[PDB]
Design a protein around this ligand. Structure first.
Ligand SMILES: Nc1ncnc2c1ncn2[C@@H]1O[C@H](COP(=O)(O)OP(=O)(O)OP(=O)(O)O)[C@@H](O)[C@H]1O
Ligand SMILES: Nc1ncnc2c1ncn2[C@@H]1O[C@H](COP(=O)(O)OP(=O)(O)O)[C@@H](O)[C@H]1O
Ligand SMILES: [Mg+2]
Ligand SMILES: [Mg+2]
Lengths: 422, 422
């Protein structure tokens, strides 16, 4: 239609109206006003016949293309849409009500899609191109953006925006979802309250962050909890929480304060309990020190499918930090610091369940010896395709952290809960 | 209400009339006098009337806000306040008697809090800002300051001021609280006077630093004492003490002076006693050398929950130094260097107790063997919930360090205190 030709002509004319870095750094309102003025002047020059609403829509589209996120803007604004999927400039899918459906939306060119994706990832200081075709990030809004570049994605740039959900689950919801039996809920409450050094492992999308947010509710209000996280996602209810946020390197690459520096500083900030948002670098090492030297009860999320895998990953993480420790020293440090590893995994049917509560008991040569206080035993599938399982206690009577439970008077609750279900 | 509104109006008028550039480097007394005159003129013009004391207090508060530290200045002045913790401009906490308590000291806005933090850090010739958000400094007063800027501190800049307490506890206080029986006090006096290579290990918040500072009171004044400590907590009263502190590397990663380097240099100062504030890394190794190769009489704290746990920790930290020393060599070094390990722990009721005063009598069967001279035996909680315990002397008539006590002519005090405790 004539609208497309008019938009193309307006874009071509405006291309020389300002530098690429001029509007990107200027005020958004000023840039929008300038774009509106330029669009009106171009329309008047071309004598394009359109209504005032049509002119406003054209101006909005021009602004979105110049500095926005292009034809994604209608989809991003919508609330019913949970996921946006762009498999090339000509394929856009959206998830509504749990159903994925195709949309008439289509980007102008694969180059436009690549430009928009680069804009989105740079929004958080990350860059995607032929030298880094894969880029996964979490936007400030909380949505997660995953981008694959042309050289990997044959059909064009592949973009996945999982929009943020502001709702937060609670231990009541987890027990009602059967993610943890009531006895498991009480034992986890004891673990959180007794200042045990948690490590909330889990798999991609398995619910580690939500589990950690629900577990932190067991922290005594008087304690000073300090939160280090790559993106604001935890919501503690404690009156005395301190929220820190790792600053990614700028476009030039300066000003990079990694989470390791944040933890190293928290060591000198008088925190009662350090809560690392997600251990994804060498900070693990420092965190373990904070776990082992004061700051009892520090938690931390980790990406690993099994507690043994989590321990192996932590050891490899400490090794990768460049510190010249031997493997046995790292294993000894892990044994000393970590108290209990909670494993959250997503079952084959898509449901999420806490599979293991594995207390690290000690070391034997090159193998860390641990005992599973709680284990999820699967038994089959329901007629609707859902998995069926039960949380069973391994019958341990005096877990290593029992002393801590005794120290805080939570001995009775643990004693009754851990043996109520077996 | 009325006072707050009047102060706000007066401050606005002064800011509109006072040029901040002149007060940036002008004399404090002259600037204060000018501010007081301007405030009086504004009050006369603004129909502000109050008591002479109220007007003087308002003028002083305005002057402090303009140039001083602001609303937290009275807290800094107060001795009773041990630690100040301001996370966000609207939440302030103080440590009183070891208890964290919120206060109604609310800053006007996060901008004022950032300005006050910048003023605080300026004293040490350092700057904290968006470019350099993390700052750690030791003010001339001895109070440590840690500041985090907005881009990292999500809920506003954070400021932790750990003031240097002067009223350090003495052995008289410790015996007053029954933390150590008077016989235990005499044994500790003998241990500290006779230059024993002792390690004061303890649990979180147990009182290791206070115990070490009480132990240091027993050293002959003529002895040259060199203290290496990150936080500068110890306060000795001898006339020939040398105080050193480490340096954390700048965010660029250069300038670090680890405790290891400090101790390695202290080896070349002919010190009579090396007193490491807290052993936390490979520096332990060097200390052990300084403990056995001259400088006999060293001391050093360490975070561990039991004498055997402390020894294992020392082995681990020596191992993590990158040296090729096997387990046997390290254990032999520890046995030959250390004499007395003092374990202080906090009990269920929050009361500190010197749980153990043990020796390291030797190495047998490839494991280090200890010998408890003083132990704490608990007899269950009382009807009030307080733990009931007694200090029991094992009755060992000939401790390994006995000869040392004899060399200084204190053997009679040792034999009396150790036996009378039975
Ligand atoms: N037990 C649960 N029951 C139902 N929904 C859950 C459960 N745990 C998590 N969820 C939901 O699953 C989605 C992903 O969970 P969450 O955000 O906690 O992921 P995560 O484990 O932190 O992921 P990542 O590995 O990417 O950091 C969110 O909608 C969360 O609300
Ligand atoms: N034996 C004791 N009795 C009573 N209070 C103590 C004792 N030892 C330490 N404290 C208190 O504990 C507080 C902190 O102790 P601290 O020196 O930090 O021990 P550590 O350095 O081992 O954590 C001090 O303010 C002090 O008042
Ligand atoms: Mg997460
Ligand atoms: Mg200390």
């Amino acid at each position: 239609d004539y609208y497309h030709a008019t938009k193309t002509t307006i874009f071509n004319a405006l291309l020389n109206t300002i530098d690429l870095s001029q509007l990107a750094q200027l005020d958004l309102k000023q840039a929008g006003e300038e774009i509106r003025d330029i669009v009106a002047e171009l329309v008047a020059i071309k004598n394009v016949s359109m209504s005032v609403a049509e002119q406003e829509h054209l101006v909005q589209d021009i602004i979105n293309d110049v500095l926005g996120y292009g034809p994604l803007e209608p989809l991003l604004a919508r609330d019913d849409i949970a996921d946006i999927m762009v498999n090339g400039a000509h394929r856009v899918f959206i998830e509504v009500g749990g159903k994925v459906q195709l949309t008439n939306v289509r980007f102008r060119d694969n180059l436009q899609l690549m430009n928009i994706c680069q804009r989105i990832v740079s929004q958080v200081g990350r860059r995607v191109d032929e030298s880094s075709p894969i880029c996964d990030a979490r936007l400030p809004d909380g949505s997660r953006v995953n981008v694959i570049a042309p050289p990997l994605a044959l059909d064009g740039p592949t973009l996945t925006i999982r929009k943020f959900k502001k709702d937060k689950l609670t231990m009541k919801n987890l027990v009602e979802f059967a993610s943890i039996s009531p006895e498991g809920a009480r034992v986890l409450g004891v673990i959180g309250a007794c200042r045990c050094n948690l490590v909330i492992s889990g798999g991609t999308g398995s619910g580690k962050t939500t589990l950690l947010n629900t577990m932190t509710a067991f922290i005594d209000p008087t304690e000073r909890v300090v939160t280090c996280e790559d993106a604001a996602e935890l919501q503690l209810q404690q009156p005395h929480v301190v929220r820190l946020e790792t600053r990614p390197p700028n476009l030039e690459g300066s000003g990079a304060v990694t989470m390791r520096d944040l933890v190293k500083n928290c060591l000198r900030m008088r925190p009662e309990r350090i809560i690392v948002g997600e251990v994804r670098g060498p900070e693990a090492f420092d965190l373990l020190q904070a776990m082992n030297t004061g700051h009892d009860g520090s938690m931390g999320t980790l990406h690993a499918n099994s507690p043994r895998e989590a321990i192996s990953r932590i050891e490899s993480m400490i090794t990768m930090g460049g510190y010249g420790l031997p493997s046995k020293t790292i294993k000894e440090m892990i044994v000393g610091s970590v108290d209990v590893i909670i494993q959250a995994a997503r079952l084959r049917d898509g449901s999420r369940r806490i599979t293991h509560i594995t207390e690290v008991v000690g070391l034997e040569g090159d193998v860390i010896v641990t005992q599973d206080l709680f284990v999820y035993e699967i038994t089959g599938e329901d007629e609707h395709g859902k998995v069926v399982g039960k949380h069973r206690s391994t019958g341990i009577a005096r877990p290593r952290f029992w002393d801590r439970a005794r120290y805080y008077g939570l001995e009775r609750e643990l004693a009754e809960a851990l043996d109520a279900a077996e």
